[PDB]
Amino acid sequence: PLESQYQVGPLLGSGGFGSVYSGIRVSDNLPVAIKHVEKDRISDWGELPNGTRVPMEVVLLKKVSSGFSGVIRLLDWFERPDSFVLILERPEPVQDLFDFITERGALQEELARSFFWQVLEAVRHCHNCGVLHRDIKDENILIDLNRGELKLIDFGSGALLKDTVYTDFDGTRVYSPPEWIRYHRYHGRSAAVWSLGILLYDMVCGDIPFEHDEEIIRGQVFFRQRVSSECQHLIRWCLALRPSDRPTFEEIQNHPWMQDVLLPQETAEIHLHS
Numbered sequence: 001p002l003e004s005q006y007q008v009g010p011l012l013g014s015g016g017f018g019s020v021y022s023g024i025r026v027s028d029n030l031p032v033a034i035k036h037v038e039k040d041r042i043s044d045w046g047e048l049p050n051g052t053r054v055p056m057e058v059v060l061l062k063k064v065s066s067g068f069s070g071v072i073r074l075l076d077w078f079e080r081p082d083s084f085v086l087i088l089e090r091p092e093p094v095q096d097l098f099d100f101i102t103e104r105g106a107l108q109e110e111l112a113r114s115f116f117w118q119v120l121e122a123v124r125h126c127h128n129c130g131v132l133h134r135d136i137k138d139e140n141i142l143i144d145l146n147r148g149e150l151k152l153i154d155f156g157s158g159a160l161l162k163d164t165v166y167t168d169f170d171g172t173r174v175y176s177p178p179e180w181i182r183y184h185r186y187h188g189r190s191a192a193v194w195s196l197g198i199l200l201y202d203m204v205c206g207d208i209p210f211e212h213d214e215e216i217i218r219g220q221v222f223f224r225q226r227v228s229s230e231c232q233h234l235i236r237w238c239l240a241l242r243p244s245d246r247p248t249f250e251e252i253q254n255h256p257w258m259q260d261v262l263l264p265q266e267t268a269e270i271h272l273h274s
């Protein structure tokens with residue numbers, strides 16, 4: 001059973017993704033997250049190498065879950081009558097980025113730079129493994145408060161990466177690009193970059209830039225907090241209306257605002273240890 005291998009703790013959250021609990025692996029006291037996803041709520045189905053019908057989320061996690069710690073790793077999974085249960089690694093202590101920004105307000109740019117860089121490395125990792133996340137946002141990023149390391153979670157809206165158009169989307173609308181809003185189509189990397197622009201704005205301003213469809217389509221960015229000119233430029237570049245006008249990942253990481261990033265541990269020591 002899975003009830004014998006894991007001791008279940010408190011509910012960490014629930015929503016469109018399902019219900020996720022804190023847990024402990026009994027054999028070694030490893031901290032885990034236990035994620036329950038209802039079968040009736042799964043639309044994207046995938047196939048395992050051994051030829052098993054499994055949620056796409058599981059396929060994506062396995063493609064991504066090796067070694068590099070910028071993405072939360074899938075440790076095991078189980079099928080139940082009406083659901084799947086995923087066992088995931090859990091950092092401790094940890095706080096998600098949404099809560100972190102909520103508590104602290106807009107982040108100092110040195111901190112925003114470190115966090116954003118780490119998110120970029122994680123997304124680049126996903127793309128390298130042939131996985132598109134499709135729901136990059138503050139709630140789907142965990143902060144390891146001791147090591148200053150960020151982790152990307154929740155691949156339940158994700159897809160295999162491809163070079164042709166996507167015409168389906170079930171991620172977070174306020175992070176979705178104007179081409180999705182207007183035409184119900186987008187390409188993976190350029191849509192990802194748009195969401196990264198929303199994420200970076202959120203980090204340095206303490207809130208997302210657009211609320212309504214018409215604001216997304218107009219794409220006019222206003223800064224409500226003092227933000228450096230280099231940072232404003234990078235944000236407005238990621239949020240270009242035309243997907244082809246958006247930077248590549250290489251271009252983002254070579255942008256002047258992105259230079260001299262702190263190491264994760266330096267980041268924790270300066271900004272998180274308290």
Ligand SMILES: O=C(Nc1ccc(F)cc1)c1cnn2c(O)cc(C3CCNCC3)nc12
Binds near residue numbers: 014017020095142154
């Ligand atoms: O460890 C997880 N979440 C978590 C852990 C500690 C904490 F302090 C806040 C959230 C986790 C692992 N996978 N996964 C998911 O696939 C989805 C969610 C949702 C939790 C609610 N916010 C959106 C993501 N959380 C997780």
